[PDB]
Amino acid sequence: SFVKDFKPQALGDTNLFKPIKIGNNELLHRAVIPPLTRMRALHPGNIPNRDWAVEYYTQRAQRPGTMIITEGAFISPQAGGYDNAPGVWSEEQMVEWTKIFNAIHEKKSFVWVQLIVLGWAAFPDNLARDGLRYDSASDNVFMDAEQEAKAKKANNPQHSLTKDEIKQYIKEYVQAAKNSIAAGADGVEIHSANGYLLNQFLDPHSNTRTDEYGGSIENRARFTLEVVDALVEAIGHEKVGLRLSPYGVFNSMSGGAETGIVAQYAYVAGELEKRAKAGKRLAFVHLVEPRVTNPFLTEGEGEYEGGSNDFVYSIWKGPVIRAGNFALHPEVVREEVKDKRTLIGYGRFFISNPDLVDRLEKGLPLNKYDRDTFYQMSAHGYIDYPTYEEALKLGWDKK
Amino acid sequence: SFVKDFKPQALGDTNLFKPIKIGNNELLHRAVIPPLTRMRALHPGNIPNRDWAVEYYTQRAQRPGTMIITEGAFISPQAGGYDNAPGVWSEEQMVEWTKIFNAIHEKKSFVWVQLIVLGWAAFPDNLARDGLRYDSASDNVFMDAEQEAKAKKANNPQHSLTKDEIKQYIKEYVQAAKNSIAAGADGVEIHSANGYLLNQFLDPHSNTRTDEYGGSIENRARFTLEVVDALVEAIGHEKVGLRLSPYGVFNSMSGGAETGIVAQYAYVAGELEKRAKAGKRLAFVHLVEPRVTNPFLTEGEGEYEGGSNDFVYSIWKGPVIRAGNFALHPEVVREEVKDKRTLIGYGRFFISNPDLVDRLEKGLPLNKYDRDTFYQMSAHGYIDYPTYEEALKLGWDKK
Numbered sequence: 001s002f003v004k005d006f007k008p009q010a011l012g013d014t015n016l017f018k019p020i021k022i023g024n025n026e027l028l029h030r031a032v033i034p035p036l037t038r039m040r041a042l043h044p045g046n047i048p049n050r051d052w053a054v055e056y057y058t059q060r061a062q063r064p065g066t067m068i069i070t071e072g073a074f075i076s077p078q079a080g081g082y083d084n085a086p087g088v089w090s091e092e093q094m095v096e097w098t099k100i101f102n103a104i105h106e107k108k109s110f111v112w113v114q115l116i117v118l119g120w121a122a123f124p125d126n127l128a129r130d131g132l133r134y135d136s137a138s139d140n141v142f143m144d145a146e147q148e149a150k151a152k153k154a155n156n157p158q159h160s161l162t163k164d165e166i167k168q169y170i171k172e173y174v175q176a177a178k179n180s181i182a183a184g185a186d187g188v189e190i191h192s193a194n195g196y197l198l199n200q201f202l203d204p205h206s207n208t209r210t211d212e213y214g215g216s217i218e219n220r221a222r223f224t225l226e227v228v229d230a231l232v233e234a235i236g237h238e239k240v241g242l243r244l245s246p247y248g249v250f251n252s253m254s255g256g257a258e259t260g261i262v263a264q265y266a267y268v269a270g271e272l273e274k275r276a277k278a279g280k281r282l283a284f285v286h287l288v289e290p291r292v293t294n295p296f297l298t299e300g301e302g303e304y305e306g307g308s309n310d311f312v313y314s315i316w317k318g319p320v321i322r323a324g325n326f327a328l329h330p331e332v333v334r335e336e337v338k339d340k341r342t343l344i345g346y347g348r349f350f351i352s353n354p355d356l357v358d359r360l361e362k363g364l365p366l367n368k369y370d371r372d373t374f375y376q377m378s379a380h381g382y383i384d385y386p387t388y389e390e391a392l393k394l395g396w397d398k399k
Numbered sequence: 400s401f402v403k404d405f406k407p408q409a410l411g412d413t414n415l416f417k418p419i420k421i422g423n424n425e426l427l428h429r430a431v432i433p434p435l436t437r438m439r440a441l442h443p444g445n446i447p448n449r450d451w452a453v454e455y456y457t458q459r460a461q462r463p464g465t466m467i468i469t470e471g472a473f474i475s476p477q478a479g480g481y482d483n484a485p486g487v488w489s490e491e492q493m494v495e496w497t498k499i500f501n502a503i504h505e506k507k508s509f510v511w512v513q514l515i516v517l518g519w520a521a522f523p524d525n526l527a528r529d530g531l532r533y534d535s536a537s538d539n540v541f542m543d544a545e546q547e548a549k550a551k552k553a554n555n556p557q558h559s560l561t562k563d564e565i566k567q568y569i570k571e572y573v574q575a576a577k578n579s580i581a582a583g584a585d586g587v588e589i590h591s592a593n594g595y596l597l598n599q600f601l602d603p604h605s606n607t608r609t610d611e612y613g614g615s616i617e618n619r620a621r622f623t624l625e626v627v628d629a630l631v632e633a634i635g636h637e638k639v640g641l642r643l644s645p646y647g648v649f650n651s652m653s654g655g656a657e658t659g660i661v662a663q664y665a666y667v668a669g670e671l672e673k674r675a676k677a678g679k680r681l682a683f684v685h686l687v688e689p690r691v692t693n694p695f696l697t698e699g700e701g702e703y704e705g706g707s708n709d710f711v712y713s714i715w716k717g718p719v720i721r722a723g724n725f726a727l728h729p730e731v732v733r734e735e736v737k738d739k740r741t742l743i744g745y746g747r748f749f750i751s752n753p754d755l756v757d758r759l760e761k762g763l764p765l766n767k768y769d770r771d772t773f774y775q776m777s778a779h780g781y782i783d784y785p786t787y788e789e790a791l792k793l794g795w796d797k798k
């Protein structure tokens with residue numbers, strides 16, 4: 001059915017529908033698909049879903065010139081820990097990714113692989129089964145009670161990364177980015193948000209190290225910036241973006257409660273701009289808004305009104321993708337896109353609306369999303385959400 | 400005469416005329432007099448002007464409940480180097496300051512002493528005459544060619560402060576703050592802006608030290624925060640404010656050209672908020688706007704449009720005083736004061752309008768200022784600017 005108490009607004013008369021260049025891609029509009037983990041990958045091997053994944057991305061690539069960022073993909077087995085999320089380290093995986101990339105490109109759209117490393121968000125029992133460590137920045141605070149319980153039962157202690165192990169992860173990032181580009185991707189997004197490994201280093205709560213990788217702003221940011229530099233060198237600055245969530249609390253990050261949090265993120269932005277003047281400007285910075293500090297919470301919940309991402313624009317001078325509760329707030333988008341380098345990521349409503357871009361342009365009703373199938377092993381709630389035309393044929397305007 | 404091409408607006412219907420508590424003071428409106436060096440102090444002894452200073456402050460205290468921040472006052476001889484700016488270290492000085500404070504309090508207004516240390520802004524030849532060092536954070540870059548010339552002629556080399564010398568300055572700050580409060584001041588403002596000593600430490604251009612006082616964000620901010628803590632301990636958090644100019648380029652600071660500049664200032668703000676939750680919240684943070692990156696330039700010149708101070712509000716949760724080209728822009732003030740903890744500092748037009756507050760309330764014409772007498776040894780352009788009533792009697796509406 002359609003979202004009931006929503007008054008759509010046509011955004012065709014705004015910059016959301018002005019073309020823009022991101023890296024090597026000529027986007028025809030500024031509605032971006034942000035990375036959305038869907039858990040349809042198959043076990044063993046973390047293989048992109050052989051039955052449905054091409055169709056899912058094809059559907060969502062349907063508006064020509066759409067930028068798509070993939071669901072997070074593990075750079076290596078040690079970086080993983082969810083059996084049904086995909087990786088980008090093996091030939092088996094890349095064969096499926098290549099079909100996905102070809103399909104998106106056939107629709108005249110673009111695809112950026114998000115590269116992820118879970119750290120403490122991983123399931124310790126899955127890792128133990130596979131003889132893998134349970135990693136994080138430090139070893140004196142756990143993510144939450146459920147993870148502590150899983151670690152205890154699995155006899156798999158949260159491990160503070162040694163330096164060489166950080167270097168190994170960097171090696172894996174480089175190979176993963178190379179694999180992605182070689183298989184046909186337009187670029188990669190480095191995930192440094194949402195409480196995953198790089199974020200665990202950035203955050204003073206999860207990072208209590210006393211070596212060069214913690215204990216200060218520059219040190220906490222070291223790992224993230226090393227990955228940025230390794231990837232820019234490997235595949236080019238124009239094929240690399242970075243995702244951050246300064247006010248996020250998901251996966252036990254600090255958010256605005258940490259008074260040093262803006263300085264930490266301002267520093268990272270500064271270092272990117274530094275490189276940008278040094279000739280190596282990233283394709284974009286992608287920010288999760290304080291509009292959504294936890295993506296599991298329904299729209300309008302977990303809003304942080306005490307902080308803004310606007311500080312980033314004073315520092316970083318490249319394109320900025322912003323994501324978080326924008327689908328139901330066209331009045332907010334209308335204002336934000338007046339800035340000529342701002343793009344808008346729409347997550348949950350791209351899950352439920354394969355033709356979301358047409359709907360934004362024309363101010364059409366939106367399909368409600370079904371949270372129950374966000375992470376199901378099913379085609380249902382993955383590839384069977386209707387376009388607006390299909391919805392009308394199904395009589396959804398009458399429900 | 401009045402400012403010719405200005406269309407005044409009455410601001411009586413805005414928060415600019417809502418009372419607010421700053422430290423121990425119940426301000427009756429939010430138009431603040433920011434610190435304004437006027438160079439009327441007498442030599443020898445850096446003594447506040449025995450003839451005119453009481454009258455000057457009395458005039459500008461005339462609207463009941465006005466917060467006045469004094470011209471910068473040297474904490475010690477070594478901290479000085481301008482013969483005609485006042486100090487707050489000697490009995491001779493404090494006798495004059497006490498009369499000033501009494502006069503302001505008689506008008507039911509408030510007075511905060513700004514404490515300053517010049518560093519490389521000082522005249523090396525004056526210092527050499529008095530057997531004093533020419534100090535800064537470092538010794539490998541000079542402020543400008545004129546200062547280099549003065550240093551050469553005076554045989555007085557720019558000296559990078561040793562650690563114990565930093566400690567001595569801290570001792571002097573503490574005694575200076577005590578002297579101020581004892582003499583009757585409502586509080587002090589720590590000047591960490593405008594390219595003076597504390598700012599010289601904050602800025603990566605002027606601070607190239609490799610010890611604990613430089614080489615990182617935390618280190619560059621160390622001196623400023625040590626002064627803050629020393630003063631909060633000495634006289635109370637409610638009697639202490641801090642002034643910053645993140646985008647300033649005056650006295651050879653970096654401004655927005657430094658990509659790390661927002662992180663540097665965000666860190667300081669974070670540390671203040673940290674103390675604020677630790678029970679010791681400063682009375683205010685005072686910011687110079689990117690509206691004016693150099694106060695010597697006429698209004699509308701030296702504007703930096705590439706950065707905003709708004710980031711501070713995401714971090715620091717106390718009162719914020721903002722200064723820079725607001726007198727001629729009531730339309731901007733009207734918007735900024737919608738924030739209920741924002742006060743507005745008016746510098747140059749408080750020099751020329753002793754009754755500025757009445758004029759802002761009622762939307763009256765403003766007296767033009769005379770830059771030639773900003774720093775003259777004269778009553779002219781100091782205590783002879785007319786109130787609006789006096790201006791009309793002088794026929795200024797006809798000029």
Ligand SMILES: Cc1cc2nc3c(=O)[nH]c(=O)nc-3n(C[C@H](O)[C@H](O)[C@H](O)COP(=O)(O)O)c2cc1C
Nearest residue numbers: 034035036037071072295323324325346347348374
């Ligand atoms: C089901 C689901 C899966 C997600 N997966 C990822 C992910 O793999 N990587 C990532 O950086 N963010 C992920 N996010 C966060 C989104 O990219 C987005 O920032 C968030 O949903 C807020 O935007 P929205 O209100 O438009 O949904 C996910 C969010 C949801 C709801």
Ligand SMILES: Cc1cc2nc3c(=O)[nH]c(=O)nc-3n(C[C@H](O)[C@H](O)[C@H](O)COP(=O)(O)O)c2cc1C
Nearest residue numbers: 433434435436470471694722723724745746747773
């Ligand atoms: C003549 C003059 C003297 C000043 N003296 C000081 C000072 O002693 N300390 C300080 O922090 N700022 C000083 N400033 C900067 C002002 O406090 C204020 O930030 C600046 O003039 C911009 O505000 P305006 O446009 O309202 O004049 C001075 C400015 C002027 C024009």
Ligand SMILES: [Cl-]
Nearest residue numbers: 081082083084
């Ligand atoms: Cl799993």
Ligand SMILES: [Cl-]
Nearest residue numbers: 480481482483
């Ligand atoms: Cl002088």
Ligand SMILES: [Mg+2]
Nearest residue numbers: 370372373381
């Ligand atoms: Mg169901």
Ligand SMILES: [Mg+2]
Nearest residue numbers: 769771772780
């Ligand atoms: Mg004259």
